Amino acid sequence: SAHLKLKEMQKVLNAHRQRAMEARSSLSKAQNKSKVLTALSRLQKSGRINGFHGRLGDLGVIDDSFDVAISTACPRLDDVVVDTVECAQHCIDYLRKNKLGYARFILLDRLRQFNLQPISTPENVPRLFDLVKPKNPKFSNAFYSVLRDTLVAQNLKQANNVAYGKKRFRVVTVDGKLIDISGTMSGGGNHVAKGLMKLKVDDYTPEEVDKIERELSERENNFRVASDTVHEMEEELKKLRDHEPDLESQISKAEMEADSLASELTLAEQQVKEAEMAYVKAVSDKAQ
Amino acid sequence: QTCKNSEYLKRRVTNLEFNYTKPYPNFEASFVHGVVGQLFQIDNDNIRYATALQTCAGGRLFNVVVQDSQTATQLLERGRLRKRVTIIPLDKIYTRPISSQVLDLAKKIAPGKVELAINLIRFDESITKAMEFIFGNSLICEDPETAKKITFHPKIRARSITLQGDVYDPEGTLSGGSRESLLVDIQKYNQIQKQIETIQADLNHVTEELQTQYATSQKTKTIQSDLNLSLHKLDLAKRNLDA
């Protein structure tokens, strides 16, 4: 039961472990964006670089009520929008020289354009592409390259049209449920996503992550010394299971040797009185 | 000793861990092959491409394989979903191949600085189609300028990966920055796991043959009682020689 309890609590550790990682991951992402923002504030301000547009979020505004919808739909709203290849390359290597973060970039010169005209969307489903109000229409086509088949459904009608109707599209439910065309089973959960376009912030203090790491370390140390005690008890049990049979065999051979000595003693004790009587009858002879 | 001193590395290999609750006991758990991470390995030279490898899988490193569609859907529905993940069934995933003609043409245009994704991985044959769905659409180029001129080629639409971790998408998409390389520890972890499984199977076979030998030894002790009786008779006769 001891080691049972051990595994029990160590299972808890694993849970804590992964959940901590989750928080850590989020924190990293957060801090990543933060330092990314620094570049967006610094590299564009110095004027030494040109053609730097910024981020995809620094563009046309969408309705605020669909913030969770667009947050769960695509994170690529955080993509770095630039135009020329060489400027992007040089700032990438300048950022990597000092290790100032990590993100994705897109080039306007290689942006494949398409037709941004709307299509017939039956069953009264709104298209988020028309809802966006871009300040620069020249990028709207790029939006069609990013927001491909962007629709919105509700009232659980996804099983009729979004599953398979006239054509399957990347429809995002008002609450955040997304059905992808790729077919893979999107595992749901309880992850939060909001605060990407104002017409959310789940940041925690670094001391909280520090105390989580400290409690993880102390739990790991406690479980390690518990496993050490379990190993010591297992070694003691092995010592007992080795000391049982050798002692039983030694007591068997000891009782056998004692029986042999007793038989020898019984057969030899008659010689005592035999030799005593012989010596007496020899001493009594005194004629010579 | 090995399985007790090698868990300081487990603190880093945590996101690849699989967790679930069995919805249906009658369902065959063999259909859930597991996470795609430990289901395949990488050869030695992939170390020189280690970082690049992450890109070639991306978040796809955290997918779980299921046999068919209905079982995957019911496991997702009744499995008490806790975190947003991605699951791949095997029955409905389409395999989109790439014409090897453009592949060899790009290999001949750029001599030496060309690598194929499916040629730099080691996996099971029964899931080769899965590799055609994930690792069957990417390429690797060493020099950055070569990958840049390959990306700008109209016919050569190559999903290139520059060794510094630079994804050269055929549509001009490019990444960059310092993330890190969490594949070497996962490789060590799965190697330790496979050697632990081998040693455990060997020890289980040894324990089974030991139980057989223990039954034979129970019979041999049944006769060894009389053997000890004869040994005691021998000792008594040896004592009576000089008695």
Dump the DSSP string for A8-63.
Answer: HHHHHHHHHHHHHHHHHHHHHHHHHHHHHHHHHHHHHHH-SS-SEEEETTSS-B--
Q: Are B36 and B60 in contact (CB under 8 A)?
A: yes
CA distance B163 to B139: 11
CA distance A178 to A74: 10
- In chain A, the residue whose alpha carbon lies closest to the alpha carbon of B87 is A185
Q: Are B15 and A28 in contact (CB under 8 A)?
A: no
Q: Are A213 and A20 in contact (CB under 8 A)?
A: yes
CA distance B52 to B173: 16
Tokens 């804590």 sit on residue: A16
Distance from CA of B58 to the nearest CA of A (A): 13
Residue-wise burial string across B44-55, b where 16 or more C-beta atoms lie within 10 A, e elsewhere: eebeebbbbbbb
CA distance A245 to A248: 5
Residue A101 neighbours by CB distance under 10 Å: 21
Residues in chain A closer than 8 A to B180 (CB atoms): none
CA distance A18 to B223: 58
Helix pair A206-284, B184-242: axis angle to 10 deg: 10
CA distance B89 to B64: 8
Q: What are phi and psi of A287, to 5 degrees?
A: -70, -50
Question: Between B148, B173, B176, which is nearest A96 by CB?
Answer: B176
Q: Which helix (H) or strand (E) holds A125?
A: none
Q: How many helices (H) and strands (E) does chain A have?
A: 6, 6
Mutate to test the interface with A, among B71, B78, B173 (most CBs of A within 10 A): B173
Which residues fall within 8 angstroms of residue B175, CB to CB, at 6 or more apart? Answer: A102, A103, A104, A105, B55, B165, B166, B167
Tokens 């000092």 sit on residue: A98
Residues in chain A closer than 8 A to B10 (CB atoms): 17
**To 5 degrees, how large is the angle CA A151–CA A153–CA A155?**
180
Which residues fall within 8 angstroms of residue A233, CB to CB, at 6 or more apart? Answer: A2
Which residues fall within 8 angstroms of residue B71, CB to CB, at 6 or more apart? Answer: B27, B31
Which SS3 state, helix, strand or coil, does residue B116 take?
Answer: strand
CA distance B235 to A270: 21
Distance from CA of B80 to the nearest CA of A (A): 9
Tokens 């029964």 sit on residue: B126
Residues in chain B closer than 8 A to A106 (CB atoms): 172-174
Q: Are strands A52-55 and A80-82 parallel, antiparallel or unpaired?
A: antiparallel
Question: Between A89, A185, A191, which is nearest B83 by CB?
Answer: A191
Cited resolution, angstroms: 7.5
Q: Is the dihedral of CA A67, A69, A70, A72 positive or negative?
A: positive
- Number of alpha carbons in the 13 Å side-chain half-sphere of residue A236: 6
**How far are the Cα atoms of A137, A202, A217, A218 from residue A214, in angstroms, in the given order?**
52, 21, 5, 6
Distance from CA of A288 to the nearest CA of B (A): 34
Q: Are A43 and A52 in contact (CB under 8 A)?
A: yes
CA distance A225 to A258: 48
Q: Are B121 and B83 in contact (CB under 8 A)?
A: no
